[PDB]
Amino acid sequence: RAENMLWHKLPKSIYFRRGSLPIALDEVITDGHKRALIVTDRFLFNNGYADQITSVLKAAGVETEVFFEVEADPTLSIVRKGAELANSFKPDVIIALGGGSPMDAAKIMWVMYEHPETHFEELALRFMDIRKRIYKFPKMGVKAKMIA
Amino acid sequence: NMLWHKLPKSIYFRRGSLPIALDEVITDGHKRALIVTDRFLFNNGYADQITSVLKAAGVETEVFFEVEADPTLSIVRKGAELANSFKPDVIIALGGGSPMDAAKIMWVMYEHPETHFEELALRFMDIRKRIYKFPKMGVKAKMIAVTTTSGTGSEVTPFAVVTDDATGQKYPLADYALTPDMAIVDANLVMDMPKSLCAFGGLDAVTHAMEAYVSVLASEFSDGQALQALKLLKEYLPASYHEGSKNPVARERVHSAATIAGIAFANAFLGVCHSMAHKLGSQFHIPHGLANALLICNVIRYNANDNPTKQTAFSQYDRPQARRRYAEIADHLGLSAPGDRTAAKIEKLLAWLETLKAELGIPKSIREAGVQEADFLANVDKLSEDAFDDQCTGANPRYPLISELKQILLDTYYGRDYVE
């Protein structure tokens, strides 16, 4: 009977303040990052909620594309076509937008883009609860990284 | 202005977590390992349990045990020229303080041998100013931090101090990039250390969090952790001193809460209490943990006076004050009647500090700590005018003046209190 050990795992950096997006986004420009794609929902794009991130990116100069089809609940059909757009673009940074649905689906797009050969249904029985530590995920972040 | 909250990627913590955590570094691609240790911890059986399990799978590891109580820019250099003779894949640091801050400079100058140390000591001395772009690190190696002391949070914070060889001025370094990408917090490594290191490390942890809550750099992300370590140490430190290892639950709680204060002071920065204590413990050769223990009695009252001396147009218009911030702790830990004033709560908190210090067996003043009048009144000035330059990052909103920072040493030694 081996005693179980806990953990405290978090993202490397968390930025927060009134108007902290452009300054945090700038750091990314200074680092080597040429290609990036943005995952978004529908309601906010018709508003002025998409130019505040694209315009600051175009001024420095980077290839950004529009992904405007994610609805309230991802249905494994738009994440597949998102991966199809991902490996047809070869991005270096994945930037998620929206709360809930478009940020949960961006993680799956990241896995399927970084491991095209691995089927989704293989991950449905190996990794479904964060309490086991006997099976390891294939290493990630090799050719992309996630901004939330 | 724009704040942040930076932390190591993984923090494994429980009793006997070292063998399980070390398995993670062997289940992925890792063939060469480097270990940094002190003389004392290698002579006994404290740096071999990690090595045995590491060799069990099969790797190449070696121990670099020449780090003394304070790095002098040469032993780190020696290990660096050792590092480029082995091409290590992972660097594992053991010990608390000097053996851990030392393993960071070796790490940075192992990946950038071209970058001469003078650039780091001149470009990266503080973390508030992010205009300077520190070169990327972690392409050919990663650092693992293991703590063998309960009270210093040097495994999660990007702070490292080195001293010159020929001369004696300090060379502080601070860049979020020096934080290890995995920290291991184990409690079985602290089981038999005497009741003279649990009393000074614990007070060091108390000081590490008591002012991070009142620092001008405190955000809504760190007061949740600083307020917990003080709550955790006020009910387990006394039980981990009189009874020692006979109560193993208290030791685990104290050891785990030292890293929580480490998280708190990795983001917010330390006040004047930890800068004058940083020099007074270097000239008189007293250990780190004493220095911030005797003056915490008189530095708290230094932040309660109404002196106009304060950070200009800052920490006074946005931040209200620190007089009532301390009073929040007074009833957070339950040291106040339902109806009192702020002054009464401050007095009760100071009285609790008095009882905790007296019961834990530490000298009441510097005079009984092993310092005489001969080398104090002639060196108090040279020690006083040096703390002002000592990285005091606008914390302790009451802006310090040398002429009045002097009198708090002049009255701490003789044992009296600061009264205007």
Side-chain angles (χ1 to χ4, degrees):
Chain A
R1 184 258 260 270
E3 74 310 6
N4 266 352
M5 59 147 204
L6 287 321
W7 49 75
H8 189 92
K9 291 180 169 117
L10 299 180
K12 271 306 244 182
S13 318
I14 308 191
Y15 300 108
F16 55 96
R17 256 331 172 197
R18 274 284 294 99
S20 172
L21 185 38
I23 165 64
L25 202 38
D26 134 85
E27 153 265 327
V28 156
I29 291 331
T30 85
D31 204 340
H33 282 330
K34 342 300 307 183
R35 311 181 78 84
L37 78 177
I38 283 65
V39 202
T40 328
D41 90 5
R42 304 311 315 92
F43 141 81
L44 75 92
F45 211 158
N46 325 327
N47 319 321
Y49 269 83
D51 38 35
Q52 44 199 135
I53 168 178
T54 317
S55 81
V56 48
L57 279 173
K58 306 313 299 215
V62 269
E63 33 273 64
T64 81
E65 61 262 51
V66 158
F67 193 92
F68 69 126
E69 65 259 42
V70 170
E71 77 310 11
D73 163 6
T75 87
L76 190 49
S77 291
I78 49 64
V79 69
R80 208 157 255 153
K81 84 167 304 316
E84 299 310 329
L85 163 62
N87 51 13
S88 152
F89 179 84
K90 266 65 53 155
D92 204 6
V93 162
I94 303 165
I95 297 179
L97 246 202
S101 211
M103 210 156 29
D104 262 19
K107 293 171 194 162
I108 296 320
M109 291 193 211
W110 185 23
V111 185
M112 263 147 39
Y113 159 77
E114 214 154 327
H115 290 302
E117 74 289 2
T118 289
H119 306 75
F120 166 77
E121 58 275 23
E122 203 213 68
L123 309 181
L125 320 93
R126 286 202 92 162
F127 318 99
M128 61 202 283
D129 47 351
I130 39 157
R131 284 169 328 134
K132 303 163 166 190
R133 277 195 89 238
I134 61 202
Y135 314 143
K136 78 198 324 311
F137 223 92
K139 85 182 325 313
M140 303 255 308
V142 161
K143 52 193 202 170
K145 86 193 194 91
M146 262 270 288
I147 311 314
Chain B
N1 51 356
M2 179 273 240
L3 300 174
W4 63 81
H5 176 288
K6 255 135 166 189
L7 224 49
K9 145 171 299 295
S10 305
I11 309 189
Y12 296 125
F13 67 99
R14 260 324 191 212
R15 208 149 240 180
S17 306
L18 188 40
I20 307 103
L22 270 170
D23 168 336
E24 184 136 61
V25 324
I26 88 168
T27 188
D28 43 4
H30 281 334
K31 317 299 282 170
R32 310 193 91 82
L34 239 202
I35 300 163
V36 199
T37 315
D38 56 272
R39 309 205 142 285
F40 167 111
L41 181 167
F42 195 25
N43 296 0
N44 44 18
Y46 264 144
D48 40 301
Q49 55 250 82
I50 155 179
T51 318
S52 44
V53 47
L54 202 31
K55 316 318 298 193
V59 279
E60 32 270 62
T61 91
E62 62 265 21
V63 202
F64 179 78
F65 51 111
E66 313 83 340
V67 200
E68 62 304 11
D70 195 78
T72 74
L73 175 56
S74 61
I75 313 97
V76 46
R77 193 81 59 70
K78 169 62 224 84
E81 333 319 318
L82 159 68
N84 310 61
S85 86
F86 180 69
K87 326 302 152 166
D89 208 353
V90 290
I91 293 87
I92 304 166
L94 283 81
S98 96
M100 209 141 45
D101 310 34
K104 285 177 190 171
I105 329 292
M106 327 181 30
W107 188 29
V108 52
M109 87 206 328
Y110 163 65
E111 306 222 9
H112 302 333
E114 49 280 3
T115 299
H116 160 35
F117 174 65
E118 95 206 359
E119 290 104 284
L120 319 161
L122 240 186
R123 251 175 74 98
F124 324 108
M125 44 204 324
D126 62 351
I127 40 153
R128 326 193 271 99
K129 286 318 154 169
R130 66 190 288 98
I131 61 91
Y132 261 125
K133 166 54 69 73
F134 176 81
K136 164 227 62 54
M137 167 141 30
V139 279
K140 71 205 189 170
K142 46 172 55 43
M143 179 184 168
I144 321 292
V146 181
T147 325
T148 69
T149 49
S150 290
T152 185
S154 195
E155 60 274 62
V156 304
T157 76
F159 299 146
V161 194
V162 280
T163 46
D164 202 285
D165 272 312
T167 163
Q169 79 300 332
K170 319 297 193 184
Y171 282 168
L173 268 75
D175 50 290
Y176 274 105
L178 290 205
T179 89
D181 29 4
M182 147 150 54
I184 291 166
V185 170
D186 207 312
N188 61 10
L189 308 167
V190 285
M191 294 312 344
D192 35 27
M193 41 159 261
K195 48 166 62 55
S196 65
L197 212 72
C198 191
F200 307 153
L203 273 284
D204 180 27
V206 172
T207 294
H208 271 202
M210 191 105 189
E211 48 72 356
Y213 184 80
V214 316
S215 156
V216 312
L217 224 44
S219 49
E220 40 254 19
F221 262 78
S222 305
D223 304 48
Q225 305 250 268
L227 271 196
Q228 153 102 333
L230 309 187
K231 147 78 67 63
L232 226 58
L233 265 75
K234 84 148 280 186
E235 39 201 43
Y236 289 88
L237 214 36
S240 175
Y241 181 69
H242 321 145
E243 331 170 353
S245 173
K246 301 340 312 173
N247 177 7
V249 201
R251 184 124 317 182
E252 203 211 280
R253 286 319 145 70
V254 168
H255 180 88
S256 265
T259 321
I260 297 169
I263 292 169
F265 97 99
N267 304 355
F269 207 9
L270 308 206
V272 293
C273 168
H274 218 266
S275 42
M276 46 203 320
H278 225 147
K279 309 288 180 253
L280 164 144
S282 165
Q283 158 135 342
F284 294 157
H285 284 77
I286 88 176
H288 187 22
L290 274 274
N292 34 27
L294 319 89
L295 43 57
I296 204 78
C297 176
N298 245 333
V299 72
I300 291 328
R301 290 184 212 77
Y302 166 58
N303 301 357
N305 56 349
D306 296 16
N307 55 280
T309 78
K310 190 123 144 187
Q311 225 287 3
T312 184
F314 203 34
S315 83
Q316 44 173 337
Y317 230 68
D318 38 351
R319 277 323 311 295
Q321 41 61 45
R323 195 133 62 235
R324 186 215 44 65
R325 262 201 99 80
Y326 281 116
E328 178 307 321
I329 279 177
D331 52 359
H332 171 49
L333 279 35
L335 299 318
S336 181
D340 314 308
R341 291 304 311 115
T342 298
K345 294 159 197 159
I346 281 314
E347 298 337 322
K348 281 176 182 187
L349 183 288
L350 263 302
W352 176 76
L353 260 302
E354 292 328 342
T355 73
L356 180 65
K357 290 205 302 194
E359 83 80 17
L360 260 161
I362 48 176
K364 273 47 47 193
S365 188
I366 306 283
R367 188 138 44 60
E368 40 272 53
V371 161
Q372 72 286 25
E373 287 282 85
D375 56 350
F376 207 38
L377 294 295
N379 309 59
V380 80
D381 39 64
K382 197 250 173 177
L383 203 56
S384 192
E385 101 285 21
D386 188 278
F388 191 28
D389 161 273
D390 202 10
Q391 70 65 188
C392 305
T393 42
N396 332 105
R398 293 302 199 228
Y399 201 54
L401 296 321
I402 303 286
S403 162
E404 49 80 344
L405 196 59
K406 176 147 268 200
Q407 68 61 3
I408 87 160
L409 289 311
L410 305 194
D411 71 357
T412 307
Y413 179 90
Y414 304 68
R416 316 105 66 209
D417 252 354
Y418 179 17
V419 170
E420 275 88 327

